[PDB]
Amino acid sequence: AGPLIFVEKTEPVGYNEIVNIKMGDGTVRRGQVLDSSADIVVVQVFVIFTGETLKLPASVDLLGRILSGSGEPRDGGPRIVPDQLLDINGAAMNPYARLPPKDFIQTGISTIDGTNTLVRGQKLPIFSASGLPHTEIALQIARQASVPGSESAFAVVFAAMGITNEEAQYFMSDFEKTGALERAVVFLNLADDPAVERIVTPRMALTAAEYLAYEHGMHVLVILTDITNYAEALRQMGYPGYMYTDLATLYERAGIVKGAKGSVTQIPILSMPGDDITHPIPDLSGYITEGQIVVARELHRKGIYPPINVLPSLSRLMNSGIGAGKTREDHKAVSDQMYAGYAEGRDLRGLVAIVGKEALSERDTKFLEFADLFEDKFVRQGRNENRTIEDTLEIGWQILTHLPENQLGRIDNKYIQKYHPAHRKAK
Template structure:
């Protein structure tokens, strides 16, 4: 039942406080009508028997004590239909692409429902992104949440677009009961991005045709910060509908989670809450977990929800509360590196601190290629040794190193310039990625490949033609 009041007592930032004579439901949707006839939407953020705190999505400008507050008796709902694919929506879920109004098949609360742990299926099916540094070294798995840790000025947006454009589920890995396989969809949720970035995203989606299989939620930097708190929930509600009702494999890309957390801090300051680390709310861990844990697979459903949240680390500091808490909740991270970017490597993914905790379950015999795990382990070891030797070269010079050490230095250079470097427009299959890995590993002596099964070495190691000719002469 709708209730209307004209009892606004205070306006603080994005919040409006009003007196009530009976409790109002938490998260209930509110309409505020200003004296000049404008209507703003909001959501109950705090409720007692005497007053409510309302966060206003469109901003509080023009609202005063003479405005009326109407409680609608329902929480925020997302209009859901399969026809959302190909549409561009605002941060509050309204169409902004000039298309028709959404005719929903159903509406659902955006807060979602927690997946029963007993009903969860363990993630172990490979998603091919076409990016060698991810597919080969930090494999993404269906139902996983794998964030990208970046920083200001780095091309994480280009990497996000590349993944959105190229990500696929290999047909042999799709185990749908009907034998036809599930379709792949991308939900792209942008929070607090600039108009320039928005134009770049949309131009790429439209030019490549990726928009046809995508739903885009766009919250710009000049939109109210409070709107950013609902954008990811709208995106995830849409993803859950497509995955668990329409059997899509859905990849959700959320950028930038730092802007989302800044919105939480702004709201917390307006409520005069006691701040936690660096001024962020003490409940930020719980809030982020509510979003990240909406990824997964459910037993009996063919679809899946996979998340790639992107965040920019303030000051390039991975101990900052946002990346720190994100790392605890998610299953790994992909690092975008400033040094590699300055060298012109595209995408500048630094694999040594990167991690995919579910990689071992998504690769290997019967899942990708039988040599995938061994190749990944050996390249990690060889690249790490080459990185350590670079520090030594700065002290003693390259001439002081042994022939073996120089081969590892050459491997580290080639790994960055040939394996990681591929450009933002190149889509490599897993076969191409692993074959390229073998080409690099074949520059090392066979006896150095101590992490690879001998049968795999015999099958894939690329012998040097000149060496073979010398052996034949002998």
């Protein structure tokens, strides 16, 4: 029933106790205690205890720290000294502007920047499944993401839920050794930590991102891995009917912030369970309103990292993040043409398995070969290969040369003459 609000444990409470919760403006909401850890009370909202909301200790000094799901140090450092104590439920400060997401976030991964571009303020889930490398892709984006040319500084907030010890040490090591830590706040919730902390983890993370974005004028990228495990924690506390509204209190929290010098961008990982007997398939579609990045078993089976299939992927806001002054003027054309040539080449793989390879026409054979060049040169890149959008677009142009120039129906002749390697002038 009713939505979840998190409260600091200041006095003992009982199950089903009726309580008041003090909101950031001095008003109070009433609810009932649902559960609690030793330090955090979970309240369902509709003489008596009046509770304070659970707070994040907020400071620019959160950057470079690795913390638990409850905000406590996990890196052997001192507790955070706060500038502000901010309600993590999201209710003390409305940082979001009524503005659409826009302008480019360069992940350095061609199958996102090139064909499915992430924009500032967007929520763009990675949609994956058991046994696929969504975790490596999330960490690669956390190492590589930037906002080319932005006057606002950039930060990452990386929140991992229900993870093993082994995973935790791997994530800490990767952030530390690459320097990615120095612009990040990292929240790690272990599988064995109290379960209440698992559901507080993304609220801590989004609070930190809102504080950096709005009070320090930053574009902040929040990567949340992964929401299925968060759904699991609600279930443990089919999925509960209130889960769909609860998820909305996570996916409402994204966008450009007031003043438009900062933004909160989310990339949640939505992984489908590999055995629905023990882990039922949750409906996480509420999070998918601005497109998705699809991690595909076919590509992984073929030994290609990252195994992202651009055809089912989409970024509904891409056009607000690309072109002259953002990426390059020819970006939309090249994206459209690669998409169309790869879709045609893939259908032609079907055709070769109907009529045989030697029956395909010479033109069809160019498109068949293009689908292989696309997967081998454009989709495939190294774990630590950080490609600028220029790099991405020039790979695109090189593999597009395999097609007959007269078959480039998605590219304006003005871009063919300016950028196609057969016509472009050396400057």
